[PDB]
Symmetry: D2
Subunit: 284 residues, 4 copies
């Protein structure tokens, strides 16, 4: 199997009027991420896929359509984290046996779980699935204990703290760190991350690779300049409602983008003009 | 079609090792709330019931068992809110048909939902269930808009703010306000709440009701004294892990309180004896 | 000597064009708080007095005028807190010998001071003045170590937390607790405070005594109603800029109440009509 | 005059045990930064020099000694921000007459000042001194309004947010941006800052230069390794109390670094060995 370096699209998901998965749309979006946007993998059933709004079978369904839509070279990570540990294990099992290269799982939220409970949450999932696990982000000393598990191969780092990122990069040199913040990709890149996961790479993945490459290939100034342009895109998208707007941009490419699953509201058409100017300026 | 003032137990729920509901153990906890603690009703599948760790079928299960557990004298509120809007509607109808007096739904969390998305999450559930709804706590202007809908009969108020609570109370003298903070019951009472929902009422319902009545009768210094050592209990139980420690205190009464659902951990025995020291001091 | 319980006006201060103190205005305001509003005492050079915008000379200046405006029976608390400990001790001495019945000092802010540095800040001021001290903002055990000192007679309690207030009151029955949140007086009173310090008592002093008295006598419903009324007032002045607005209300009584000290801005005349209506509705 | 690109020490200040400035030790700390760490300039009476613990005459004192101690080619920025706008104007005038190249002012704190009050605080100081101003503490238009002023030549940027920093660098390509976070120099550098202001540069100024230089020449990976080194130094120093520990390191170079001003506590000797190890490991 792989090491999981590279740039991943946080897979977006198209729905009908009743919060049901549009599979033909979903296949188009996965294929847009690899063939058109030229990314290395898909990060399936994360935040960006409106995962936590779904029921278990929808999650399995998305896991299914995504894996079928792409070649064997395409790296795949499966987010299975859920407040329902039994569900996590079940999705973990289902995903592992579909051939997903690694699992990852959101930290137990809502309740104020203790570190110990958070820790044995990950360990229980690994134990029942025997797949590689990527965690979320916790102190250095607590990472230290998590990464002591041979099956916890790394972290999806989403906290915009570049002091903590550097301490983590220095202390765990042989561990996978993927950054989760699109608008600070070039800062993550020189801070030594091994790749990135991103909702906006569904639309802007070709610029993201240049940032990631130029910044490691010395050409930091040009990389920055491309981060300037991407942050124009990101700030605009964030301002209209990020997921529906991204899917609105993909619809413009002849993709069946469907709707957001409620309680997410659809793209508000009062934003239509501004979005078309954005689509025109950066050619999306 | 009944009155909703009063003190509620937020139903605690017993599980086995595989995180399955201990059916018979639940029945007891239900009855312990009504008969021994003498509470006006049951708040079912709220956060205290570990509800967000469950799948839909367990949630229906807890709904039926809690209902068949109690008399009709007993007010029943069904917490039905979930990130899955479809699931909330399904639970909503199901709880309504079972005869729960009002529905109730947590604020859609995890994502940064706009206020209009939050508003139409409630309106969608009300529409599909045609049952009275109790919301969580969002500004006063926004409350005004939400309370404008007729089938929104009030709010379960958990925010530490007594300025805002006073403003709501004044601005909506005809809507129901149940407070959610056990350790400040005496302050919510004289702020004119219509009742309270609590986890610690499973154990301490009789000091709770006396806090509630004595305060309304202006016997306030007495009511306070009771808060002053209901807070002993609460401070203690929080420092040990509130839901497993609470269900520990019920085991000490012959109730089959089972285990927490993982990733919640079982009560840690290193506390066991500060615990029953307290069960002793306050006769729990 | 003096019993420090009671209601205190946090003393507003009038300035001229250049930021220099209006002593005649100040004396009127001082007298208004005792003679007109019938308060047991003054709290001089607190936040409400724009104290932290002042130089040392001016702070003394205020301390002197406030002493010379009232009678011997009038309780007088001096806030001398400052990031400059040399300054605090200089004012601490000056105010103690003017005859102020106690000193108060804000917790050292801006820098992330440790508890030890904070503790010994308070102890250093007492040792140099031998006067009584009221602490002004930490852990209940920290309170213990602070209140373990005989010359720390109490705390000006400002944080809107009624669990923590309940704990401090149970744990230190012999210590003085004055609350600083006017809009939650009634809740503070039934929580056993010995009195209160408020900016708005300069203007709504008489309703505050009634709130404080009625609450204690079990006339809780009438107390809460006067809280409704007073919160209309409080909410309104907060929305117009509280210190400039409070002072505007005072000018209506013919008190030469002057200007805020820059960079505070003068009362915006666009709020004039709404303020005049507030004044008329509540007879201010 | 000079245009203020480059690296500045946030000038540390030595005190006797009564909190009076050790002027000869200060003169030594000043030359240390320029002659030994080879920095481009001094940032004087910022928070690293314990400015907000001082009185006005001490502040002028530190402005005076620091200017005397250095050659005319040294860039000098005077922090004259105070809550007392009269004090700030006075200090700004003084530092300007002494010859300081620019003033700088902390945003008004402690009170909830509006944006307008903040804007006109800066505008008042500028008009009274006719010196260039460097702002620091939030919107982009709020930034754009301040930056509209030709005397506000830039900003000491201390918020560790690299989305906003990028947004400002793009929107104002011609303004001066100096970063204030030493532990993220390399991330600041590639984000296009014109330089940096730092307390630890008093001790690590040469490594900081190399980070700033190497990154801009696109040798990002060796710049980053030097950031790894500097963060060891910064993390250790924060864990021991940063200002006292920085001055202890200076003392080891024969500088009379004296004592922190109370309520700051002096360096704790239980940290001596760990500090000696750091000094040895990094040749400090
Ligand atoms: C919370 C979130 O959606 N963040 C996403 C980022 O791609 C974007 O920067 C974010 O959507 C907007 O900045 C990304 O990390 C998604 C996340 O990896 C996931 O699990 O889908
Ligand atoms: C966080 C929490 O569970 N709060 C509970 C309160 O009764 C208590 O004050 C809490 O358990 C202890 O602070 C209660 O509001 C739970 C809530 O009502 C529910 O839906 O179960
Ligand atoms: C921060 C502040 O000025 N709070 C005041 C309260 O009286 C009022 O509740 C506040 O002004 C309006 O909520 C009062 O505590 C003043 C303060 O104690 C002081 O030292 O002057
Ligand atoms: C609050 C503080 O001391 N920050 C300093 C930074 O150099 C360091 O990164 C800070 O010490 C944390 O490491 C520095 O920015 C101080 C500031 O520039 C000043 O005005 O002295």
């Amino acid at each position: 199997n792989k090491d999981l370096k590279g740039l991943y699209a946080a897979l977006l998901v198209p729905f009908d009027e009743n919060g049901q998965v549009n599979e033909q749309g979903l296949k188009q979006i996965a294929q847009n991420a690899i063939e058109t946007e030229e990314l290395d993998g898909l990060y399936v059933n994360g935040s960006s896929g409106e995962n936590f709004l779904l029921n278990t079978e929808q999650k399995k369904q998305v896991f299914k359509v995504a894996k079928e839509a792409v070649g064997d070279k395409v790296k795949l990570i499966a987010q299975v984290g859920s407040l329902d540990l039994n569900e996590a294990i079940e999705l973990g099992k289902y995903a592992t046996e579909l051939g997903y290269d690694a699992l990852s799982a959101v930290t137990p939220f809502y309740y104020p779980f203790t570190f110990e409970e958070i820790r044995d949450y990950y360990f229980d999932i690994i134990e029942a699935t025997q797949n590689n696990m990527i965690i979320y982000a916790i102190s250095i000393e607590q990472f230290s204990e998590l990464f002591n598990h041979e099956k916890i191969v790394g972290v999806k780092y989403t906290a915009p703290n570049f002091f903590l990122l550097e301490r983590i990069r220095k202390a765990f040199p042989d561990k996978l760190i993927l950054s989760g913040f699109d608008e600070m990709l070039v800062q993550a890149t020189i801070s030594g991350v091994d790749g990135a996961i991103g909702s906006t790479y569904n639309v802007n993945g070709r610029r993201a690779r240049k940032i990631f490459d130029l910044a490691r290939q010395g050409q930091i100034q040009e990389a920055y300049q491309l981060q300037h342009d991407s942050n124009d895109i990101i700030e605009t998208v964030l301002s209209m409602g990020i997921y529906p707007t991204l899917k609105e941009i993909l619809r413009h490419r002849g993709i069946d983008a469907g709707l957001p699953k409620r309680p997410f509201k659809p793209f508000n058409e009062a934003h239509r003009q501004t979005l078309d100017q954005l689509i025109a300026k950066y050619d999306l």
